Ligand binder design. Structure first.
Ligand SMILES: Nc1ncnc2c1ncn2[C@@H]1O[C@H](COP(=O)(O)OP(=O)(O)OP(=O)(O)O)[C@@H](O)[C@H]1O
Ligand SMILES: Nc1ncnc2c1ncn2[C@@H]1O[C@H](COP(=O)(O)OP(=O)(O)OP(=O)(O)O)[C@@H](O)[C@H]1O
Ligand SMILES: [Zn+2]
Ligand SMILES: [Zn+2]
Lengths: 362, 96, 184, 145, 48
């Protein structure tokens, strides 16, 4: 009974672990099909109803079938991930914890830094009876005991690592035990190690890839309430295709410098906004009708937004949008203002971004 | 050009000793030989510490080697710095 | 210093090695304070010099400002420096660094809650997921699974993962709510 | 075959001007500056199309009112009342525009979605006009190098 | 390419003698050996 149910469960786990990647690509294909269908989606008129128009009259059922299939494939991808990749993550985590226990004494000599999430979470697995479940070194507790037992108290180390000494001594001595069949449900529920499973689920929940797949599944679910949520799954091409990773690394390689360049551009534009707000307010009227002026630099925030939104996007700078300076006592000052804005913002900083991308390539 | 300059600095530091200028290939005949030589035998930090110690130490309390280096430093003659030679190269036959 | 000099100048002496194994502890204690350089001595030979490095000097050297100064000096020497001027520039840098570290020694006078909230959310949500499995009253489902049913067992196999996913969603919601509470 | 068709229509002889690539060796270096990274260049265009489709989805779901392109008030010319029409409008006009889609769509001042639409336009300009075109430029220069 | 050509010129001049072409590694067995050889023994200015 329990043997055959465990065998079928193992068969299912093996199937999903084998087919994790195939279902991973099938999800992307179904997402592309759904979005290609969505390219034929129209508004109809009072609340608007988003409607689908097609000459064949066949794609509307196709959309629901594809959405259901995508949701099922996302769930199956979560199952395949949990079958295939989670064991490696747990093995690596158990290896790291064991090596820090043995060669660093992370929980005997020193203590976790009190701001390390995984370091604090790993206190749970030490006391468990199912430690190196995946890692091969089943003697890690004995090794830590041999290394640190005499100096820090052998009973103290035994309590820290969860090893019992009385049961070991009595089993070495005259010990009488009566076997219990695995078929008992109470037996299996007592045998399962709750604390170790708690720590394992904590590790899995903190895993990044599992979180990404959960977000994928959530977006797939939301796609049924609103079909345009299936467009979020098109962001998965970055992980689907390896060749796109080179193009994306051309940007992510210098991402910190790219963000800092934008911050510097914002600071420079703020300085230009200060100068304009203090001296060149008369030139920021954007209304063609003389009756109602539309001054864009009568307020600090409005002037800064005007600059950052319009002057940066403009080909020639802020002077393309602000009025003409001819025949004014501040004409030369404003010409210098516009030329310096064009040179520093439009030419140099954008060139900095270009050079960052090209340097990442090189 | 800035990236290339940084790469050149890294390459020079990882390939040749700062003091004597001997390449890592010679020292690597012994495992970790270049690292041992650049961290224990020809450490620029150790040379700076020796300069500190020689400056702070009383001139009357100098040993023979300290007096030699002190006179050379006071006349700003840097021949006491090993250039192209080292302990392991001078005693190559005896040490190895 | 005597033992180190003897060991280095006699590298294959078992009798001296025995003294080294007798004196690890003193040598280990004095290891950070033992300076070692090589010079061209007065006898036209490379000679090795041993001296004392002070703890204050080592700390001043290891402070990050001095490390940045060292990096800048090395970059300058490697890029725009020659071989004739190298040992003069290095001595000038050493003198400036020594004065700065002496001045620093003279002037010297002789997230957590967000991580705790995340840990609490993990513990609470995972315990909620453990309660349903450890209820021990699963006899109501062994009722229906007394006979093997491929469809039923596949359904339960999927339901376990669905429960895990729902628990993860609850944990994520709790982590947000806690972060909003902390920031506001 | 093109030479033969040139007699029926003399403008088919212009297809033979594509033979300079094989005629001149020096032009092969300039052309290899492009063909060296041709796969990456095509993938960059595909990525640009996907990003523009995402922007089209956002605009079609939230910013339809701003896509009127008719100066006469009697006959509106809404360009984002249909998914395909909105995507074509984006891919055709916003990409070619110097400042992005905001150069062509109307002004967002005095609207409850003003800040959202400003973020929309700025992000479109930064990602599409600035970054992806820079990716193409860098691909060509890297092929040269 | 112009920057790389300048770097190559500098590297060649600093690593090998202009006349004989022997690398600096051989001459550097004596302190300042390469500089002494290129300034006193094999100076192109002296050949001119
Ligand atoms: N004379 C020398 N003294 C010290 N290191 C040298 C010397 N010659 C070459 N090196 C090499 O320089 C490298 C040391 O790097 P560097 O001097 O830039 O500082 P660092 O120790 O890496 O600094 P940080 O503590 O900030 O990491 C090593 O690879 C070492 O082999
Ligand atoms: N045959 C050689 N004659 C002279 N210098 C040589 C020779 N071979 C190599 N070199 C190296 O060339 C370098 C001399 O530089 P270069 O010939 O460009 O002129 P320079 O003396 O630096 O000029 P300037 O007086 O303008 O500073 C030195 O590093 C020297 O070791
Ligand atoms: Zn050296
Ligand atoms: Zn020569």
């Amino acid at each position: 009974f329990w043997k055959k149910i465990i065998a079928y469960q193992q068969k299912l786990l093996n199937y999903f672990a084998r087919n994790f990647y195939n279902m991973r690509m099938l999800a992307l294909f179904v997402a592309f099909a759904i979005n290609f269908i969505l390219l034929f989606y129209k508004v109809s008129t009072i609340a608007v109803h988003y409607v689908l128009e097609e000459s064949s009259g066949y794609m509307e059922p196709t959309l629901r079938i594809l959405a259901i299939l995508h949701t099922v494939i996302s769930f199956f991808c979560i199952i395949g991930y949990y079958c295939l990749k989670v064991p490696l993550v747990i093995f690596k985590r158990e290896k790291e914890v064991a090596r820090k226990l043995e060669f660093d004494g992370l929980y005997i000599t020193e203590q976790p830094s009190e701001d390390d999430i995984k370091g604090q979470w790993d206190r749970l697995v030490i006391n468990t009876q199912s430690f190196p479940n995946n890692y091969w070194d089943k003697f890690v507790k004995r090794k830590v005991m041999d290394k640190y037992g005499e100096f820090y108290g052998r009973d103290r180390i035994s309590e820290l690592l969860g090893m019992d000494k009385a049961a070991l001594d009595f089993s070495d001595a005259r010990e009488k035990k009566k076997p219990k069949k695995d078929s008992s449900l109470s037996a299996v529920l007592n045998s399962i190690d709750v604390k170790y499973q708690m720590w394992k689920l904590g590790v899995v929940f903190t895993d990044n890839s599992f979180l990404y797949l959960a977000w994928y599944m959530t977006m797939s679910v939301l796609g049924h309430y609103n079909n345009f949520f299936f467009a979020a799954h098109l962001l998965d091409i970055a992980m689907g295709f390896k060749t796109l990773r080179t193009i994306l690394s051309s940007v992510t390689h210098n991402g910190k410098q790219l963000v800092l360049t934008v911050g510097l551009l914002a600071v420079v534009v703020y300085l230009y906004t200060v100068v304009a707000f203090n001296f060149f307010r008369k030139f920021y009227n954007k209304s063609e009708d003389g009756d109602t002026p539309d001054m864009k630099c009568d307020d600090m925030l409005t002037c800064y937004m005007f600059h950052m939104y319009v002057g940066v996007r403009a080909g020639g700078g802020i002077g393309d949008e602000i009025e003409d300076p001819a025949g004014d006592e501040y004409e030369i000052y404003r010409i210098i203002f516009d030329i310096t804005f064009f040179f520093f913002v439009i030419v140099i900083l954008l060139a900095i971004i270009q050079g960052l991308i090209i340097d990442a390539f090189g | 050009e800035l990236r290339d300059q940084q790469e050149q600095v890294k390459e020079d530091m990882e390939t040749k000793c700062f003091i004597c200028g001997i390449g890592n290939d010679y020292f690597d005949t012994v495992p970790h030989g270049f690292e041992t030589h650049t961290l224990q035998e020809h450490n620029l930090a150790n040379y700076l510490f020796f300069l500190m110690y020689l400056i702070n130490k009383d001139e009357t309390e100098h040993t023979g080697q300290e007096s030699y280096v002190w006179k050379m430093y006071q006349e700003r003659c840097w021949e006491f710095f090993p250039a192209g030679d080292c302990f392991r190269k001078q005693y190559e036959d005896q040490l190895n | 210093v005597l033992l180190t000099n003897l060991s280095e100048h006699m590298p294959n002496d078992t009798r001296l090695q025995t003294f080294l194994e007798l004196a690890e502890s003193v040598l280990n204690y004095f290891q950070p304070f033992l300076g070692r350089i090589e010079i061209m001595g007065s006898a036209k030979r490379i000679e090795r010099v041993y001296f004392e490095i002070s703890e204050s000097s080592r700390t001043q050297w290891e402070k990050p400002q001095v490390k940045e100064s060292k990096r800048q000096f090395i970059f300058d020497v490697v890029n725009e420096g020659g071989e004739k001027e190298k040992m003069e520039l290095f001595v000038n840098f050493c003198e400036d660094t020594i004065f700065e570290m002496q001045l620093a020694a003279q002037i010297s006078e002789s997230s957590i809650l967000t991580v705790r909230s995340a840990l609490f959310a993990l513990r609470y949500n995972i315990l909620t997921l453990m309660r349903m499995l450890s209820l021990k009253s699963l006899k109501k489902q062994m009722k229906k699974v007394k006979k093997m049913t491929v469809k039923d067992m596949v359904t339960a196999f999927f339901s376990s993962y669905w429960s895990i996913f729902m628990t993860l969603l609850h944990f994520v919601a709790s982590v947000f709510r806690g972060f909003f509470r902390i920031i506001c």
